[PDB]
Amino acid sequence: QTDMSRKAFVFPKESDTSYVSLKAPLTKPLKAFTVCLHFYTELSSTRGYSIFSYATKRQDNEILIFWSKDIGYSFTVGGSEILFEVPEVTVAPVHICTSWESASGIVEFWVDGKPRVRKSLKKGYTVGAEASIILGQEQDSFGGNFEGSQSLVGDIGNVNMWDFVLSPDEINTIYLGGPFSPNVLNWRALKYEVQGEVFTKPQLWP
Amino acid sequence: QTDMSRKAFVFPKESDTSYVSLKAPLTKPLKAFTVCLHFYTELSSTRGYSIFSYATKRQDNEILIFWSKDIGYSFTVGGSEILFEVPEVTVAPVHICTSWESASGIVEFWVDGKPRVRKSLKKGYTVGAEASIILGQEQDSFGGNFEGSQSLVGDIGNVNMWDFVLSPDEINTIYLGGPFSPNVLNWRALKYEVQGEVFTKPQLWP
Amino acid sequence: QTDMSRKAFVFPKESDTSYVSLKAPLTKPLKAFTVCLHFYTELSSTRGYSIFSYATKRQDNEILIFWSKDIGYSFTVGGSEILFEVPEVTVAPVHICTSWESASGIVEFWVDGKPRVRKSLKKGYTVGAEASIILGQEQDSFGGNFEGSQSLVGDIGNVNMWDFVLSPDEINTIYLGGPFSPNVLNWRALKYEVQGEVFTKPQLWP
Amino acid sequence: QTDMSRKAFVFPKESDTSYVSLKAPLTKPLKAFTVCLHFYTELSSTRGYSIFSYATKRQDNEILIFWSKDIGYSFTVGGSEILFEVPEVTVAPVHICTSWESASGIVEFWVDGKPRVRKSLKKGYTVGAEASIILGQEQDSFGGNFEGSQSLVGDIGNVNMWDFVLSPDEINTIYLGGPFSPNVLNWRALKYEVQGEVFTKPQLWP
Amino acid sequence: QTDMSRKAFVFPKESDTSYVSLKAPLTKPLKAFTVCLHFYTELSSTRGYSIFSYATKRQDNEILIFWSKDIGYSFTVGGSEILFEVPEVTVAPVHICTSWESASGIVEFWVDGKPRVRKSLKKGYTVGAEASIILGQEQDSFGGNFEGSQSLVGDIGNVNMWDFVLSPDEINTIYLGGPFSPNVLNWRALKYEVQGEVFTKPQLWP
Ligand SMILES: [Ca+2]
Ligand SMILES: [Ca+2]
Ligand SMILES: [Ca+2]
Ligand SMILES: [Ca+2]
Ligand SMILES: [Ca+2]
Ligand SMILES: [Ca+2]
Ligand SMILES: [Ca+2]
Ligand SMILES: [Ca+2]
Ligand SMILES: [Ca+2]
Ligand SMILES: [Ca+2]
C-alpha cells in the first residue's frame, strides 16, 4: 500500500515496455463498477491512445477506456464498444468518470464534472473478478502483447474504482477533490508495480 | 401517486415499445395550459425526436412538442404547427416551458429561462379533457402506433403541466427549481405506468 | 390614463390592421425630443419592420425609427434618413433610446445602454406639435395607409418620450429601470387606443 | 481657462473647416512628452482619420497620431513614422496614451490601459516649443490647409499632455480616471478656440 | 549586484550588437535547473527570435529557449531539441517557466502558470558549470557571432534560474509574483553587463 495523494505517474516517451500494473483485492465478479481517474496528454490530435485497460484470462478488452482519433472517447465492456462524440478537444488536464450497471446496462460518462447522455451496453453481462489492470498501455492479451500505437504518453493519476454505481452528487464530490472511500482500487492504498521508464512526479493539475 | 423529485426516466435504446403513460385527473377541457419539463439527449444533430405528446380520441397530435432536424423546436396544437428557430444547438440538458391560451392564441416558448417571441396559434380552439400522455414516443393514434424514427433516446423529468398561463416570474421560479403547485400534472404526485425498457435513475442536471 | 408598468403590447400576427394609437398632450412644436422604448421581435433576419412612427398632417415620416434589412437601425427626421451600422444582430429584447436637437442637429442613438456615435441630421428643423403616434405599423399618410411589409410582429413597451435631450446619466438611469418623469409620452400615464388584434400581456424582459 | 471635465467636443459632419485650436503655455522645447486622450468614432472601417496633430513653423507633422486604414494606429515624430498593428477593431470609445523620450527614442503606446511593445523613433531629436495644436483635422501647413479625407468625425476629449514620460502606474491611474496634474495641456485648464461646426456636449464614455 | 525589481531590459531596434551578459556564481555543473523569466514582443507572427541563451566552451546551444515561427516554443538542451505546439499566439506579455532533470530527463514547460505536457530530453546528460548567459541574442559561439534574424526585439525581465526542479506550487508562487530565493541567477542580485543599445525601463506587466 502507498498513499499517492498529489502524485501521478509519468509516461514521457512513446514505447511498448513502459507500463504500471495495479493490483486489486477483488474476489467476487463485479455486477457494477465506477472508474474515476485523471490524465493529461497531447496526443488527442495526433493518434489514438489507451487510458484505462482491464483484462481477464478470457477477454483482453473486458473494460477499456480508449480515445479514438477524430472521434472521441471509446468505452467498451465485454468486447462491444459505444462511442461518445467529442467535437472539439482542448489541450488541458481532463477528469473522466465512467460507471456501469449489469441489471440495466446504463453507462454514464462524465467529463470535467459535466455528465453526458446515458447509453445501454451489455445488459445482464458479468465482469470477471480476477484481472490485470494496466495504465498507459492497451493489452490485447493477459498482461502482455503491448502496442506502440495504442500506448499512452503523458501523465495519469487519481485512479479510483468502486464496485457500484455512483450518484451525481458523489461524482461531483469526486470532481471537486473532496473526501471519498473507494473499495476496489484506491489512490490512497494503491498496490502498484512499475516496469519500464515510468517516473513518479507531483501532479500538475490542481 | 409517487414523489419523483430528483429522479428522471431513462430511454437508453432506440426502439418503438419503450414509453411511459402519464395519467391526469382532468375532467374539464382546457382553455389554457402551461407545460414545463426537462430532458437531455444527443440526437439533436442526428434526427428528429418527440418530447411531449398529448393525444385524444380525435387528434393524435393535439399537443406535441417536437424537435425538427436542422430546424429547431416544433410546437403544434390541434394539428397546426409553428416553428421556433434554433440556429445553434448545444449538447447539454435544456429546460423548456410552453404555454398556450385559447382566448388570444398567444404561444410562449421558454428555453433555459430565456423567453422567445410570442406567436399566434389556434385562437379560440378548445383542447379536449380526456387524453393519453406519452413520454419518449410520438403517437399517431390513441396510445399506439409508435415510431422508431420519431421516438426519443435520453433522459426526461420534471414534467409539470398547469391549466392556465404562467407569468414570467412564475416561469423564472420554475426554472430556478423553487416551490410550485401544479394541478393537472405534478412531478411530485405523478401517476405513471412503465411499459418497455424504461429505468428510473437519479437526474444528471442540478 | 393607464398605468401600464410591467405590461406591454403584443403583435403576434403579421397584418395591416393591428396597431395602437398613442395620444400626447402636446401644444408647442418640439425643438428637441428623446424617445426611449423597448421591443422584442424575431424579424431582424427576415425583413424590415417599423418600431416607432410619428407623423403629422404634412409629413408621414416626421419621426420614424425603422429597421433596415441587412443594414441596421434607420432613424429619420423630416424625411431625411441616417443609418446606424449593425454588423451582427441577436435574438433578444433590446432597449433603444433616440434623442435629437434642432439647435445643433446632433442625433444620439443608444442600444442596451451602450451609446453610438453622434451624427448630424436636420439642423434648425422644427418638428410639428400635433401628430398621430402609431406603434407596430409604419404610416405613409396621416393615421392610415398601413403596410403589411413594413408592419411589426412582436412585443413593445416602456415607450417614453420627452421634450428635450437627455444626459448620458439620465439615459443610463432609464436603461437601469429606475425612476423618471416623462412629459410628452409617459408609459405610466399613457392615453392609448387599441384597434385590431393587439393584446396586453406582461412583459418578458426584466 | 475652462474646466471641461465630463465634457467633450463633437465633430458630427465630415468637412474641412471644423476644428479646435488648443493653446499651450510652452516656452522650452520638449525633450520628452506624454499625450493621453479619449475619442470615439465609427470611421475605423471606412477610411483614415486624424486624432492629435501638433505642428510647428518647420514641420507640419511634428507630432501626429494618425489612424491608417486596414493597418492600425500611426504615431509619427519629426516626419518619420512607425506603425502599431491592429488586427481587429471594435466600435467602442477607446483611450489611447502615447509617450516619447529623446534621450533613448523609446515610444510607448497604450490602448485601453493595455500597453503595446516599445519601439525606437527619433533618438536625440528635439521637438519645438511653439506649435499649433488642432483636434479633428490633420494639418499639412502651420494651422491651415486642412483635409476632408484626413479629417475626423466623432467625439474627442480628456486630452492631457505632459512634458515627461509617464510610468505604467501613472498611466493606469490616467486610464482609471483618477486625479492627475498635467503641465503642458490640461483638460481642466484648457485654453481652446472653436472655429466651425463644433459643439460641446457631455461625454458618452464613463 | 543590483536590485532590478519592477524593472526590465528594452531591446527596441533589430540589430546584432545589442545584448546583455548575465554572470552567475556557479562552480558545480548542473544536474537540474529551472529557468523562469518574463518577456514581451510582437515578432511572434513575423519571424523567430531567441529568448534565453546559455552556452559553454563546447556547445553554443547548451540551454536555449527559442521561438519557432508558425510552430511555437523551442526548448533544447545539449543540442537536441523538442517542440511545444502553440496553435494560436496572442499579443500580450507572457510568463514562461522551464525545468529539467538529468536523472529522469523530464522537461516541464509552463505558460502563464498553465503547465504543458511532460517530455523526455537528454536523460543522464550533464550541463556545464561555466557559461555565458546572453539575453536578446542567440549565440552560435562562446559569447559572439550574433544573428540579426535570431535576435530579439522587445522587453524581458524577471529572469530567475535555480539549480533544481521546482514544484507546481512553487511555480504557481513564481507566477503570482510572491516571494522566492533563487541561487544561480537572481533578478534581485543580478550581475549584468550592458553592451549596445539596451535601456533599463520600468516593466509594463503587472
Ligand atoms: Ca486487446
Ligand atoms: Ca490493440
Ligand atoms: Ca401522430
Ligand atoms: Ca409520426
Ligand atoms: Ca410613410
Ligand atoms: Ca412605407
Ligand atoms: Ca501635414
Ligand atoms: Ca495630409
Ligand atoms: Ca548557436
Ligand atoms: Ca543561430
Author numbering:
A (entry chain D), B (entry chain C), C (entry chain B), D (entry chain A), E (entry chain E): 1 to 206
Quote the passages of the study that discuss this structure, keeping the authors' original sentences.
In this study, the effect of physical and chemical factors on the orientations of macromolecules was investigated through an analysis of selected well studied macromolecules, and important parameters that determine the behaviour of proteins on cryo-EM grids were revealed. The test proteins used in the analysis include human C-reactive protein (CRP) pentamer, CRP decamer, human erythrocyte catalase, SARS-CoV-2 spike protein, E. coli PaaZ and E. coli β-galactosidase. We performed a comprehensive examination of how macromolecule orientations respond to alterations in physical factors, such as freezing temperature, and chemical factors, such as the addition of surfactants or the presence of affinity tags, during grid freezing for a standard set of proteins. Hence, electrostatic interactions at the AWI are an important factor in determining protein orientations in the absence of any additive.
CRP exists in a concentration-dependent equilibrium between a pentamer and a decamer of a 25 kDa polypeptide under physiological conditions. In the concentration range used for cryo-EM experiments, both pentamer and decamer populations were observed in the same micrograph and were analysed separately. C5 symmetry was applied to the smaller pentameric molecule and no symmetry was applied to the decamer during image processing. The preferred view for the CRP pentamer is the top/bottom view, where the symmetric arrangement of the monomers can be seen. Some side views are observed, but no tilted side views are seen in the 2D class averages. The negatively charged B-face of CRP in the absence of additive is less sampled in the case of the CRP pentamer and is not sampled at all in the CRP decamer. However, we note that with CRP pentamer, the orientation distributions look similar with both Tween 20 and Tween 80, but only the addition of Tween 20 led to an isotropic map (R = 3.3 Å), while the addition of Tween 80 led to a low-resolution map (R = 7.5 Å). The orientations observed in this case look similar and the resulting reconstructions from 256 289 and 204 354 particles for the pentamer and decamer (C5 and C1 symmetry) resulted in resolutions of 3.2 and 2.8 Å, respectively. In comparison, we have obtained a 3.3 Å resolution map for the pentamer and a 4 Å resolution map for the decamer by averaging 25 000 and 51 000 particles, respectively.
